[PDB]
């Protein structure tokens with residue numbers, strides 16, 4: 001009962017909104033069930049993952065029941081130039097320069113992009129490398145995620161600046177202990193009214 | 204005398220700059236005459252009004268003699284998820300979930316977008332829901348209008364941050380008292396030199 | 411030895427990255443050699459220079475060995491309305507309104523855009539009119555360059571906000587004194603290892 005997490009186009013007539021997990025073809029992208037991307041021009045979610053080279057080996061991770069707004073892009077670590085001296089990538093143009101190859105140790109690598117569950121990412125959000133976003137958080141439109149985002153907090157702007165927390169410090173502990181996105185689907189369905197309207201305490 | 208406010212493409216040869224009023228087909232959009240949109244790629248002004256659902260009933264109201272720059276978008280209220288608990292729009296995917304439908308009282312609805320007259324909205328500006336922007340203001344390119352914008356003030360950034368007021372308080376009080384955009388068109392042409400070169404005192408003398 | 415600065419597509423198979431200098435067909439668009447533009451869908455670098463009217467005469471000047479990222483745009487001075495009174499460009503619509511034409515002394519003109527050498531401009535950067543950006547600087551992706559950028563400083567945001575200086579003051583003084591981008595090309599290849607890894611003690615020595 002509920003849509004098929006493995007069905008790419010779960011909304012009839014709607015060719016723009018896609019469940020991400022079934023469309024992932026490149027490795028190192030790990031997107032949980034039911035998370036979706038609402039595309040501007042109907043293009044694939046993978047087209048929004050930028051500068052993702054297999055040699056650098058970083059991953060992009062997203063949990064379940066995330067909504068990702070149209071135009072959101074993910075700047076993977078391969079985008080960063082070397083910074084010890086000249087940023088110019090001489091080795092790319094070869095003809096004698098190909099022998100000046102940086103290695104992983106020579107680059108400002110920053111780790112994985114880790115986004116939790118039930119995250120609402122707005123429209124045209126740009127996500128910088130190595131960033132961690134917590135569960136239940138809300139990124140505003142046009143945001144540029146430049147620091148980590150705490151669970152169940154609202155953020156937005158460029159550079160990212162904190163706005164507020166969604167619930168009292170105690171109530172957030174409740175959602176994080178609940179972890180409904182992991183509960184058995186037969187159980188999630190029995191409780192969706194409360195997951196949706198926020199009355200968590202009824203469980 | 205002057206161009207036709209009702210002519211979609213008022214510049215010869217130009218196919219991107221459009222007078223908005225005559226193009227409006229969909230409801231809950233009220234743009235005043237002579238306001239125009241400079242398109243990036245020929246896209247219509249309405250193409251730039253996003254998440255506008257007739258079921259939510261919010262409106263986009265723009266005044267007269269406004270210049271809305273290429274790529275500007277208007278995030279209407281339908282864009283906001285419910286925020287009591289999970290922000291995930293379960294009901295959209297149906298298959299039993301379609302009964303978990305929110306009501307208007309359940310959503311974070313913030314009211315209309317109200318834009319004044321003689322407003323210069325820059326290129327690639329995102330306007331958030333429920334925002335008011337006063338007469339004669341100037342929105343910098345690439346801005347994200349997140350709070351109200353006072354009349355005859357320059358603003359820009361993401362989030363929106365205040366830069367400066369265009370004229371002194373006493374001078375802004377006069378332009379708003381004047382309201383040159385509402386005068387009969389026979390009178391706007393008679394004073395167009397002074398409307399253009401900022402001479403509120405000369406207009407005062409002729410009023 | 412090294413690629414041809416005059417070859418439009420210097421990377422085999424790649425059809426998006428282009429050396430800018432050989433792809434300029436208009437005057438007052440001075441980009442130094444080896445500077446390149448990595449395009450989103452194959453658009454040219456000039457396509458990204460907006461509101462550039464020859465009647466206004468401002469120029470866009472970019473140095474050498476610069477990396478201008480996909481989607482960057484350069485707002486030239488023609489973009490600014492007149493701000494004495496109504497910002498509405500009546501004259502454009504003609505039919506009696508063309509007689510109300512502004513002059514150059516009537517517009518908020520701010521001068522050329524001057525970008526230095528070895529500058530890393532990130533992806534989707536907007537550059538406002540009249541701005542200067544110093545040598546070796548790094549502009550973060552999605553930035554809106556609204557004020558000048560000092561040499562060898564990292565900046566980003568909207569509006570632009572200062573992050574940090576790449577090296578100590580004494581070290582930046584040296585790179586600017588050095589000016590490795592202006593040296594003869596026979597010498598740049600001889601020191602490329604140290605230009606790349608910033609062995610300034612070795613560079614001064616040589």
Ligand SMILES: C=CC[C@@H]1/C=C/C(=O)NC/C=C/C(C)=C/[C@@H](O)C[C@@H](F)Cc2nc(co2)C(=O)N2CCC[C@@H]2C(=O)O[C@@H]1C(C)C
Nearest residue numbers: 053055078079080081082089101102103104424427448477
């Ligand atoms: C272990 C370190 C990987 C190492 C290169 C590192 C390096 O120089 N990284 C700095 C990044 C520079 C960027 C993103 C520059 C943009 O301004 C233009 C490019 F986007 C154009 C373009 N990139 C590619 C092809 O075309 C391209 O293939 N790459 C870009 C970085 C990763 C990859 C590459 O050359 O990896 C090498 C592999 C093969 C040993």
Ligand SMILES: C=CC[C@@H]1/C=C/C(=O)NC/C=C/C(C)=C/[C@@H](O)C[C@@H](F)Cc2nc(co2)C(=O)N2CCC[C@@H]2C(=O)O[C@@H]1C(C)C
Nearest residue numbers: 014017038067256258281282283284285292295305306307
């Ligand atoms: C009285 C409240 C109206 C109520 C539901 C409102 C509601 O759930 N609003 C939250 C907004 C969610 C958004 C913007 C989610 C994006 O991540 C993806 C969507 F954009 C994709 C998409 N939207 C639609 C079709 O496809 C779509 O039809 N709608 C989106 C909001 C309005 C409308 C809708 O479901 O209205 C209902 C009517 C019909 C009973």
Ligand SMILES: C=CC[C@@H]1/C=C/C(=O)NC/C=C/C(C)=C/[C@@H](O)C[C@@H](F)Cc2nc(co2)C(=O)N2CCC[C@@H]2C(=O)O[C@@H]1C(C)C
Nearest residue numbers: 217220241270463465488489490491492499502512513514
């Ligand atoms: C010595 C001063 C030059 C003078 C007028 C300058 C002037 O009024 N500048 C203010 C800028 C207004 C802008 C950028 C308005 C946007 O909202 C829509 C336009 F982009 C649409 C559009 N522009 C054009 C054609 O279509 C267009 O031809 N121009 C725009 C500014 C330069 C140029 C122009 O009118 O130059 C005149 C010459 C020819 C006598």
Ligand SMILES: [Cl-]
Nearest residue numbers: 050051448480
């Ligand atoms: Cl790329």
Ligand SMILES: [Cl-]
Nearest residue numbers: 071073481534
């Ligand atoms: Cl993009």
Ligand SMILES: [Cl-]
Nearest residue numbers: 252253254255
């Ligand atoms: Cl939409």
Ligand SMILES: [Cl-]
Nearest residue numbers: 459460461462
């Ligand atoms: Cl233009």
Ligand SMILES: [Mg+2]
Nearest residue numbers: 158159361568
């Ligand atoms: Mg900011």
